[PDB]
Design a protein around this nucleic acid. Structure first.
Length: 271
RNA sequence: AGGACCGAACCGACUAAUGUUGAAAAAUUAGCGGAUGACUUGUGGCUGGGGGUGAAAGGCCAAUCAAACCGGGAGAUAGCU
RNA sequence: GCUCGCCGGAAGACCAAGGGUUCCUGUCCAACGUUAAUCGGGGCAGGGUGAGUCGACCCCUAAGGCGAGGCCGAAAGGCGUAGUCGAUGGGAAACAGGUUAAUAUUCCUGUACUUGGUGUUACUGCGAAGGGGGGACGGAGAAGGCUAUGUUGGCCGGGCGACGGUUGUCCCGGUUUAAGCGUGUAGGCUGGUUUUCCAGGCAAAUCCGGAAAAUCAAGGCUGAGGCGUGAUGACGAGGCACUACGGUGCUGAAGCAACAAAUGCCCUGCUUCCAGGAAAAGCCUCUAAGCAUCAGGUAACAUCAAAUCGUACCCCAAACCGACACAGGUGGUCAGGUAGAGAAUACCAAGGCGCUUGAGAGAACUCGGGUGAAGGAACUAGGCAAAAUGGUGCCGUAACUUCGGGAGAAGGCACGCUGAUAUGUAGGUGAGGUCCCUCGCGGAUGGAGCUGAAAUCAGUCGAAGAUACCAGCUGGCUGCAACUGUUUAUUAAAAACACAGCACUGUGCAAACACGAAAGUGGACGUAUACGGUGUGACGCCUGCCCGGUGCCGGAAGGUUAAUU
RNA sequence: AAUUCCUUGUCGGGUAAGUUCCGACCUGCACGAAUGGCGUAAUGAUGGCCAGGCUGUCUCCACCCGAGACUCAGUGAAAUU
RNA sequence: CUUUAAUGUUUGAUGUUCUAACGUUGACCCGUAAUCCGGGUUGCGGACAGUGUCUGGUGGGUAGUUUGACUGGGGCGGUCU
């Protein structure tokens, strides 16, 4: 649930936690773990490519199965777990053959719910089938963009896709951004919505709370000595120029989609 | 429980005096601030000059930075001393 | 050598980094030492560093580096796979005592341990560049149970007092002993055992995991410390003979208990929280391909080997970085006594120093300090500075408020010593004995003894009782910023920068964007409740009119318009 | 007003006397609503102001303890010219 | 030769479809005890994308430069034949 703390100190007035006792109070399944090194926004060249990244708490990577290629084998949920590498939570499932794996947590999954993947799977949350067999107007998540590679859409806290039509080997989708995209009619998509919806209602409350996540402070630019930014300086707060990124781009309306490759699955991009 | 309180280590450096060919090419003395955290620290590693890094001051990059240092073009040019 | 003074959570001791003979002895004083110098971290010469167990090397790896082929790139070269390097990490084994002018857990004495090689004997399913397990890990907090260590007492030994008293409840001193082996406790974790089956662990698998059954509840793992052994020993205050008063052989009494008690150990535990907490090998297992009267494997004894390099000395400093024998800077470990909440502070122990110019005088003036008549901020840009406040317990505590705070608000009272309550209370600790028992490091009871507050009452001394060091000035109005924080190393710590929060916009993933001639990488092993950019800057009530201009997002009818022809 | 030139705006408060400060007035030279507007408890080595206490800050300095200055011996600089 | 239609050949524009170039930071196998790369099978896109040359637009993102003289100091103003 969501709980609002008390103002016992400056830094706890506006803090709002998202407590979920369903999560496991113990160590996760190690066989499915893998080191995850922090970069700091730097690349092989050692230069900062993405700013506002650095520090944070150590993390271990949870190997999640977005493909769900184990068809015709039921799996029961053992326990929910906290995943720092992502917003949503995961669920450790056990397959009848003796296999254990991680998956994203749908809206109302618990410990003991049974699920199955494939074409003959049941139409209920948690199960995975290609969008060819899914009905129209339903709600799914962890959608695949190309058959066989794994889910890439609707992977966040409370994201969900709504199948609106199916013409042929393609199927139309309305993503959480309002974009009306269509994908092949064989990409595997899980039923239901990812359940952490109360995550957006969270409030960090203090600065150090953002540093734990690994986000470094953001310096605006208006007070940045124009040698370092177009906005630069000025005697006071002048800012008598158009809003502009570094390297000279608008940042307040300029569309920067320069792909021109697909331009076919896009139908009602947005607006 | 706490970017919580008082306060040593530790990290800092608000005030004053001294010193200013100083003990010291920025310190000492008396007080001062933070002191479980956006903390501090050791070792090793990475980012290289119109580039880096920067909680951003045009600050820092080996006592040197509105474009480091070394060598070279080079005996630059100097209607000025 | 006898005194004085200083540090004593260091101005002591052991190391690393670093330096690289400064270590010890003898000799010398030209130069070096901010003076002299017989002295020296100086000159000269000689000697000095002993390891199967400490450390490195070695084995395994992180970040990251190099990188066969390979991709990319005018050349140079860049990125990078398999792989190979890379500790600040993980990985087998030694303690005590004694000894040298200078080294030792390295030598000697005594007692031990570990990993390997070979052989012998007995019993046998061995094998991986593979699978699994383990290794393997956060922060905060809470007690409990122990020890290091200390205090007192007891014991042994010595002493009877430079000046009143001191054969006693007196004074001084000592009362130490390891690794290892055995016992396997406080307490922590886990339900075990056997059979059957199985879409999984790239193939297999007696191992792992899963599933269905049967049978029992006691099974196992871990685990400080203590006890015994080690130890009929060593050490040992002091003596017996030599005694160049430099020191060696021999001998050498007591060698216990109780209380207190860590920041260390049990604890990589337990509980709890969100920011959700390295990898790999060794080690334990599983088998495949293969080898089976072999080879291998297991157990016991015997035997062999464990090399190589480092080891001196300084190491908060005169030996490192600072041009100096420079009020500087430099990481980890050990952490005594009294008072104390305390690693603060004061005085001391062990131990180590008195800071490489001194003597004398006692003027102005300067520096660092103390005291002060009456007045008390009149000083001054300004209460700069200084003075003052300063602790514990009880009572008590405002406007306002986001109901948390404000607040230690303000303000006021009592604080010493002795005696009694109580020959030392409350409480803590806990022996003997007794009872019981799964006869054990047991349980119950027992309460000796040790330790020990706090308080009331009464009395008493002093000018002053939180007496010293240590140790908040307070209150009111108001601007700015919400706050904690960050910033101009070296004149600016702030109303600036950040900040959580809000909004706009971009981004559908081979994402946008960014570093890159490109490959490719980051963004992200993320997927719109996400990432990037921008402005604003908690919260509270709100955020109004204008799209002409600039820019951005869209559009059509026409006009205009490049290369090309 | 961190914004007000004329300006020490005017009134009132505090003071024996207040160009600053606080509270109102509005004639806003030249505030203004996310280059945010008006408020805001708490916080601040932050800026301004008024009090209590406290004092050598001062009226107005006096004395004293120490280190230099001064004399003797030894060693023996410096900018400048 | 004044004249136009179904044709044939010619090329031009749009649209639908296809696959063989090309793309694949999709899946499966081998080299190979390797998430590189390469080859191979298949699938999805598909003559679009993307690259090269030419070309228009945008372009302080980044460079190289300019920004007069007289002047009762200079600047502002004014002047320059």
């Amino acid at each position: 649930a969501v709980v609002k703390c008390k103002p016992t100190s400056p830094g706890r007035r506006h803090v709002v936690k998202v407590v979920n006792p369903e999560l496991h109070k113990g160590k996760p399944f190690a066989p499915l773990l893998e080191k995850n090194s922090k970069s700091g926004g730097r690349n092989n060249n050692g230069r900062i490519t993405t700013r506002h990244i650095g520090g944070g708490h150590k993390q271990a990577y949870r190997i999640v199965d977005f493909k769900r290629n184990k068809d015709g084998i039921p799996a029961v949920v053992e326990r929910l777990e906290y995943d720092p590498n992502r917003s949503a939570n995961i669920a450790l499932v056990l397959y009848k053959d003796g296999e254990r794996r991680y998956i994203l947590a749908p809206k109302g999954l618990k410990a003991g719910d049974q699920i199955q993947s494939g074409v003959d799977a049941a139409i209920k949350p948690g199960n995975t089938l290609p969008m060819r067999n899914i009905p129209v107007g339903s709600t799914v998540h962890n959608v695949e963009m190309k058959p066989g590679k794994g889910g890439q859409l609707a992977r966040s806290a409370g994201t969900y896709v709504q199948i609106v039509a199916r013409d042929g080997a393609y199927v139309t989708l309305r993503l959480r951004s309002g974009e009306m995209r269509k994908v092949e009619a064989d990409c595997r998509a899980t039923l239901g919505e990812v359940g952490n919806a109360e995550h957006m209602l969270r409030v960090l409350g203090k600065a150090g709370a953002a540093r734990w996540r690994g986000v470094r402070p953001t310096v605006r630019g208006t007070a940045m000595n124009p040698v370092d930014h177009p906005h630069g300086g000025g005697e006071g707060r002048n800012f008598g120029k158009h809003p502009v990124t570094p390297w000279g781009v608008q940042t307040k309306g300029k569309k920067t989609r320069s792909n021109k490759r697909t331009d076919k699955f896009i139908v009602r991009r947005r607006s």
